Amino acid sequence: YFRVDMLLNKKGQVILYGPPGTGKTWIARKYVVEETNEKTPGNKWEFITFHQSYSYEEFIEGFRPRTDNEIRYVVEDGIFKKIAVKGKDKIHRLYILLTKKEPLSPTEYEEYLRLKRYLWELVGGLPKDKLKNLTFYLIIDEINRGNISKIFGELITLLEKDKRLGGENQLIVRLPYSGEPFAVPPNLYIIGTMNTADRSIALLDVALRRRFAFIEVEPRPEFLEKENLKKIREKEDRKRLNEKLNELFSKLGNDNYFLKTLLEKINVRITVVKDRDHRIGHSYFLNVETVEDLHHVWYYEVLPLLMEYFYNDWETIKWVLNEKGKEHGNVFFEKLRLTGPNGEEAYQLKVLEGDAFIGALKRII
Amino acid sequence: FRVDMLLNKKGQVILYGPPGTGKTWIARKYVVEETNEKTPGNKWEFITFHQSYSYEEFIEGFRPRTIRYVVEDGIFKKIALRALVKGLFELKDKIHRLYILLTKKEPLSPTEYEEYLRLKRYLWELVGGLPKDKLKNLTPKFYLIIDEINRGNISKIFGELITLLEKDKRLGGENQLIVRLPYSGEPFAVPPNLYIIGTMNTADRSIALLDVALRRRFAFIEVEPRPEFLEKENLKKIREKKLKTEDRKRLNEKLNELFSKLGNDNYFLKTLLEKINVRITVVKDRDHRIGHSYFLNVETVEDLHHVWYYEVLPLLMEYFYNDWETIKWVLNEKGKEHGNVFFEKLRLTGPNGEEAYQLKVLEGDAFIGALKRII
Amino acid sequence: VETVEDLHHVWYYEVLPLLMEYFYNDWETIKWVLNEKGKEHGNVFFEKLRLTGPNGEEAYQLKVLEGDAFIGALKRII
Amino acid sequence: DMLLNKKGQVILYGPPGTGKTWIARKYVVEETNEKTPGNKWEFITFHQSYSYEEFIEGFRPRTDNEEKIRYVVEDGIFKKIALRALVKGLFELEDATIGKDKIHRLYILLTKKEPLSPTEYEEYLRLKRYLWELVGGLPKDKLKNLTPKFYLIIDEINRGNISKIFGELITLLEKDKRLGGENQLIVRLPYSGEPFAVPPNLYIIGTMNTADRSIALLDVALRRRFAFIEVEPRPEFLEKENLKKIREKKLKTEDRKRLNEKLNELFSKLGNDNYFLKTLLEKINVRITVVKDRDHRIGHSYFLNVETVEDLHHVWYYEVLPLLMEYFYNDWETIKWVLNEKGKEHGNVFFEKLRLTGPNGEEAYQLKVLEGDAFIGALKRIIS
Amino acid sequence: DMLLNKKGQVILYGPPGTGKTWIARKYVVEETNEKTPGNKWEFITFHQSYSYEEFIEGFRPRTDNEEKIRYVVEDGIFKKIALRALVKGLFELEDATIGKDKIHRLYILLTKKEPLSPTEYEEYLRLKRYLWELVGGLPKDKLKNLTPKFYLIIDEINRGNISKIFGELITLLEKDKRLGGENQLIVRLPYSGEPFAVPPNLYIIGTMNTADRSIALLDVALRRRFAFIEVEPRP
Amino acid sequence: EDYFRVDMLLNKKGQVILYGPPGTGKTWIARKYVVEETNEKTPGNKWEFITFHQSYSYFIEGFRVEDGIFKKIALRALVKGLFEKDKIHRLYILLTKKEPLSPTEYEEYLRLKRYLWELVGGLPKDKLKFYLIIDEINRGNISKIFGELITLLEKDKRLGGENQLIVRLPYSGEPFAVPPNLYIIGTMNTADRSIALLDVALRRRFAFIEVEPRPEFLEKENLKKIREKKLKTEDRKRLNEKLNYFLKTLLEKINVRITVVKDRDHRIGHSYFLNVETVEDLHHVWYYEVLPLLMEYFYNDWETIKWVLNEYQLKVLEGDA
């Protein structure tokens, strides 16, 4: 927890990077209750997932008139930047910001906007050190999936700790679309989740890495030791899963470290034949109760992902599975009975049930 | 059974494989009994992806009013809100007015535009306080079938569904999340009520599903070509169907006379498709095999001639375009030319040394003898 | 087509620009289609240029025909 | 002309110096009796920026004082041309006088309206008129083939994408697919939705370079619609009897005599050989044909403007010799051979060996200028 | 100079550092009596992103009552200069074309500054639409002897795709198929179909650099039109 | 060093090339030239670190903050010298606004180009500081960034010579003026041969005085003559606690190999030798920038690959014996 709680005020923000299967979305949804204690993410902690069709919606933008003929700048993320000083106007400002209904009361916008025009001089007439300290968190899931030079024009420079509210070298810039000039608070911190298996640098922006930190949180098989596994899933049915996972490993040969060493020996074979970002994460094995569901997640989730990885490359898939050239017997893929004119050799997918499926998983270790 | 377990455990199922296998058929067959309805519109919606879908027509986009523009909900947002408001019945006045606005297939009034826009303020305020042990069990079930899912830009279409479609991140899960949509500022989540089914073709690598993250959300079940169904006993059962009219029994002697002009080998079309598909797996990928649907409604020996010469031989001539030594190896006639063969070598020889064949329309008992020899 | 001029107009304006676009600057291949590969300086469609390239190149030229010399080039194809 | 009446359309192709565009324009002015574009005479030049929307039908944002004048499909140049012939040929039919003032007087004044006027009541009138034209556009197939002719010139057809700029026309421009043909076809258009067909009234003449193999007619099914008349470079034109014949017919201001004097001495200066220019071009052409493509041959248009010897010296050193250096860049020998000075490295040589060599051992040559009767001399050597 | 009166277009080839761009405008100023690139002596520098739409005609957004949805066809640099030369030349003419009310409106119009009025553009169209049928009915006798000569400089012509930037100018730039040649041609513009040709009093002077051979001019056909003069770096 | 030869040949060529390989003390001696005399320590104007990001619709184009963040220094390099008359002092009121401009008075903001059309032609040409350097120039395509830049910047084709040259741009014109005081060099280098001298015709605008990394920067009286610039908080003589031809037999023992068959302008920097102070940091000179940094560069070539040490499992030994 030491690298989790206060490795955030050093820089502006930080992105969680890793292959799929690593719960970066889950580990960003854990600090929302360990630091903000907001089980409902409506106030003081927001959650948006970026995608390739999001623009003029992380700032202020001219939207339609509130049920008229024909027209006002609607804000959608400055509402989380005007949300970070009371700890009557500002004291009630937060509800105007958290306006669940149409917040456009015939005059509610109006009260809100003027209150904004003062801020810029209420802080503009205020010194530095009183808000250098402050007693929020916005999560952008799949941050690489949106155009960072379109959702932010020239505004990701303003999230650094020096260019925020309470710094010596800190400024405010007039917002386009008739927005009072804006700046970012220092207590506003961004936790992002990124996928690196698609590309090692997916969002290839120079100003992204110079204002965000990166962490390569690895697939941890240590989370598959049966003892380790029960510590996740028990937090009337805390005991019904106990004999379920006990007889799971008992059919598996009473081995607690089975699914741990199955994953890491496969992932180290993928790391040789493919990139290191192509490792299989650990979430594919958390919802495993019986060997039937292990057989299901093997045959219907990770094997066609592996066949996608190596396509028509029977040798590579066989080697990663450790068939290692076995052409018959308990083999996931079995060589066909024909050989082509120029040396072509082919294999077919075989279904393995019973004890022949577990022992075929033993030869991959 | 493979489909109902995985659609309950993972929340999303993609059926993959070569064409001709029942991926689209088993999608309809699964939902016409779990809904007990043969027409979509209620508890059931069937769409089909292509490259002209968008996020704006799948979740929400700005559409003009016949008033400048308004945000209308896409097909997934209509059925996810329908699945949630149906599940909030048996778990009550205003949400009954909300369900009748979503099911209102006629267009909606401008007075009822902001009436519908006001009722989902109440619903998303409601589910933010209801505990995670009530929304997990909803007594109806909703199904959306996305046929040909790899023919559209899925990550652009599935805007916020990358985070939402996970089982524990649905409504009533251990990690239940509610995301604010960037259009209209409205909060949204997907219930555990709605189960999505996808169908895809593995033949086209151009449309291949290479997104690992999207792959984790769904469970992939492959419907393989099964030549076993082409056996006389099984093809008689596969043709014994909803057509239970006088032509039940009269179709079987047409099947009996057809195999009687094939040597009464009841495993002939099974061995024909099996020996062919294992040869396509060698010289090309496994995902270019012939599907069993090409040989289902064949009843006469002329009907097989229509299948063989007009569907699969022009398709095999496109796999191996101007590659005669490969296409005659699938038909086990590499060294055989100038005989009872599908392609006969032109007598002339190329100036620089080239040599090539011409397809011959083998008809009559000749046709069967060029098919047996493939076994 | 019904005249000998009409078949001369199909050959010299439609199919010979087609074959010279098929095998562009490939003279020994296109003369094999008319089986006149070793046959130069006659009633041929492509006559051999007397000039020869410095590093060994050889070129041809399209010859126009009319009358009884035309059909002998056609029976040469048969 | 014979191919134009039988195939319906002819693409003229060859090296650039041959007279392809000129023959096209001369033929059109003579047949139409119209020496100006418009009134049944159309000239266009295809380019990559050309589009199906521009040629046949596309949505055009036409802005007018009144709002919403835009957001209206605009028929393209070809469609306008097909219409303006169709219904002008519908202005005279034997005893099938259906309407006879609609097809003769509704939208000939609208389609050939030189003021591009979006008269919003009359624009709708255009549309109503077209639909009737189409139903009565099938009065009877037999009398369909009898109208007055119209013509369009597409220059540099290779430069544009014919497969895209021309769309449904690939099916239609075939002659029997036109109106009154043995297999008549009427097509449905995507944007406006109005039906469309080409008549035998409209003829299309195309111009094409084949020295550029990038813009080449690789569309083999598209070649079946057209007819290809290869105009080789006729060096026979550089002869004095023709050089005068093709250079004075239009102008009769007594400038013919001056040209006669100008070239009479010219030939006299050139060994009194009236074939000297012809030989230069022909020898050069055969030589170019061997070492490179035959379509990179020099055409006669470079040498038709020669009236004095000093005019021809500007043609060699500013048009012909810089063209040959682009054929063979740092390929000195091939240029040297085409001038029949293959190994010569001396005076009376266009390219001269540079003495130094690369550490890698490479060698180079230098172009040298030549002038006077002395320069006239090197030309004959290429012959030898 | 003599090559401009015969070929029409000259291209001053040479490597970088040669006096190619400088004498391109040194010869231009002394043959138009205009020190500044005003009516004549216009200057254009190509680049790799230069387009056909900027050169002849294209769709551009314009503000009519500050509404940006109005997209109207904008005439390019060449269209404007070619039109200006022709209109000034038509200033001297017989009775059919003697009346200069319309001619002066059009010429001043091209001569005008950047602003194009919502109410100015339509008058330009009326005059231009007239202008085609007037010169279409005018004989080819007076049209070859246009007195005021216009000139255009194209710098760095190797940078752009000249075969794409030149459109219909593959045809119209030859001297015998300008307005008043033996084979006079007039073409229809692509956007909305307006008639257009080049009068003989407009002359183009290019400037090429042979270092970038790969995207240097490769269209052999385009070469016949223009004349070529090598410029070696004479010290 | 080089601080006494450069200040005498500025009005001849305008821009001079003093080339060097990447990594060495080059990106500070560039910052040396702008801070020492004028001491302009403010951004936005005349003191901006500048390396382009190779993204260009690209003499000036690439529209939308309109065209470029620093696309108007060529006028301003003489405009402050051409201000000695509301016309004379209106340029500076808008350009000292670091804010986006309002649409309330847009027509008044772009109406000022009207008077100076023929005044700058009537301006005396000998009436004549600001520095904008291009970095990351040859990393991307230099032919894309070089439009009409090569002919305009030479010796006599400025305005201070006899050869007269104006500029031309579309979209409402706006021709500007050119001084010889302008400082736009651009880093000329060959760290990648794919783009290096792609425009081989570069003759009459530059020269080549090679700036090798100075080998005399390793002596005990010459190591940290340069290395004290950064110190501010009492660090001038903390390094007098551990000093009690030292390490010169490290550089020319390696950087004479860089020239023979090795590529010359892939040299290693001495900016990493900035603050060698303690006794623990004596591992980074033989095991970090000597042996592994020169190992995996030849094509499995032992001579290039095995030449790591001048002063399988990787062997371990510490440098005291």
Ligand SMILES: Nc1nc2c(ncn2[C@@H]2O[C@H](COP(=O)(O)OP(=O)(O)OP(O)(O)=S)[C@@H](O)[C@H]2O)c(=O)[nH]1
């Ligand atoms: N308790 C716990 N559950 C985990 C952990 N990692 C994965 N999980 C399980 O799987 C999920 C992990 O988050 P996950 O969905 O894998 O991250 P993600 O960022 O969405 O993954 P992706 O979107 O980048 S493919 C959780 O919902 C939980 O069910 C972990 O470290 N702890």
Ligand SMILES: Nc1nc2c(ncn2[C@@H]2O[C@H](COP(=O)(O)OP(=O)(O)OP(O)(O)=S)[C@@H](O)[C@H]2O)c(=O)[nH]1
């Ligand atoms: N009864 C029965 N019919 C089947 C079965 N598999 C396929 N069919 C029949 O095959 C035909 C086509 O099957 P279908 O599911 O539509 O292929 P597909 O999924 O579209 O394949 P594609 O999408 O890759 S082109 C239909 O007539 C269908 O009923 C099966 O298992 N049982």
Ligand SMILES: Nc1nc2c(ncn2[C@@H]2O[C@H](COP(=O)(O)OP(=O)(O)OP(O)(O)=S)[C@@H](O)[C@H]2O)c(=O)[nH]1
């Ligand atoms: N009078 C006359 N002139 C001819 C003849 N052949 C060519 N010319 C002249 O040659 C020149 C070019 O001919 P033209 O037909 O315009 O070439 P083109 O097809 O346009 O050439 P391209 O470069 O675009 S591929 C013109 O001056 C033309 O008049 C001919 O037979 N008679």
Ligand SMILES: [Mg+2]
């Ligand atoms: Mg995630």
Ligand SMILES: [Mg+2]
């Ligand atoms: Mg299907």
Ligand SMILES: [Mg+2]
């Ligand atoms: Mg032409």
